[PDB]
Design a protein around this nucleic acid. Sequence first.
DNA 1: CCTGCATCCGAGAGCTGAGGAACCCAACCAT
DNA 2: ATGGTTGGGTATAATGGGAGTCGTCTCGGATGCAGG
Lengths: 45, 49, 259, 48
Amino acid sequence: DVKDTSLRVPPGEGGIVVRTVRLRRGDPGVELKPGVREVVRVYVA
Amino acid sequence: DQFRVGLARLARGVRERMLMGSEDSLTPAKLVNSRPLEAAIREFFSRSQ
Amino acid sequence: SDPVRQYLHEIGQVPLLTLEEEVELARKVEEGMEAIKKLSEITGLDPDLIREVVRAKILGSARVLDPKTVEEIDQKLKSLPKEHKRYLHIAREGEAARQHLIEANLRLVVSIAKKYTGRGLSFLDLIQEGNQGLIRAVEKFEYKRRFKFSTYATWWIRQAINRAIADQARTIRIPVHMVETINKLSRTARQLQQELGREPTYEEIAEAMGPGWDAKRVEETLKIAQEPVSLETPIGDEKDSFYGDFIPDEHLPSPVDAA
Amino acid sequence: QLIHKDTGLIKEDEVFLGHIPLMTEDGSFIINGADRVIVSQIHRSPGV
DNA sequence: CCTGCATCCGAGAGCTGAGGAACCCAACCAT
DNA sequence: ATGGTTGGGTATAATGGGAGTCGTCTCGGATGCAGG
């Protein structure tokens, strides 16, 4: 009873993944908007 | 200028707290409410053209 | 234009009261209510219906139950031999006194309501809700206790204004108790920030609130307290882009799905 | 400092007024994690 | 009585692309 | 049958607001006032 909502590369983009950042609730200095559990960022070169 | 606008709002709040409150037991920390000053500074640095 | 100055002018066009007039009017209202209940017992009808018809006759033809039935009952009241038309007279006098008392005390409402601006209700809405509270206070006042009318009326005016603010300030209605919970949470967080030198965390707010409060409950309460944003919020320096221009529709099937 | 007009009692306290953004070495600001510049404005000078 | 002439108000001002502040108590319907 | 939500009440006395906006240029009509 789950469905795909994954993040994908938009048309005309791409490259090499150089970095990833994961911010979770409770980490020092992290201010996530209410309701958000975690944030994942990917840097592609 | 934005700091002055926020400080004026804070002064208005402090005056209302002075008038509504009791003069017998009062300390500066209870009267001063810094929410308008922070609001003004955020407004300037986030939404000013 | 500027309806605030207009209303203030209409308000100041009525003179204030002295203690003699105020106590006289309050006594007249009380005797009018007693006369109304005595008349209801004599005629056997409901106190509410008789009060409504007497008020209709006092206010006159200007204020638009129908003329047939009110005239019928008003003539039935004229059918009383004696010592009962007297009760009718005191009822009418008490209703006139009620009107005069409300009109004279309308200025206290404005004085009280001027301190609740900037909380999601405009000044004139606050004034009107304060007027409703004032009418309540006139209804419930008791002059025997030798208390000035403003002392009792201020409580009811404040109650009306606060209930109106908690009822009509948000696009999504939130129950009154949980509005008080939100306000208490905001006050607690503000004092915690003042003492801590930085924004508190959810755990500290939960600890400061007391028993039965944890970080998840604080998070949910802060989540529901978010106000909706405008679909017409401008985006960019030019007046050509709005917020709602970026929000797609997910309900209607796409051509691909239909095919 | 809170002073009584008639009594003359004095109560002094240090109040936390909030935060003020700091300008970096090169002359920009970090607002919500983004780099920003405040642009100078030109306007009619006050006077007669 | 007529006429013209200051005065005031309201509606205009190119296209495309990108951009983000009281509290308490008591009862009553919903589920 | 339990929280969730709604209504009523608080009694010294209190009785007319506040942010603001001044760097547009034109045009066409509606309108009130000057003259004869």
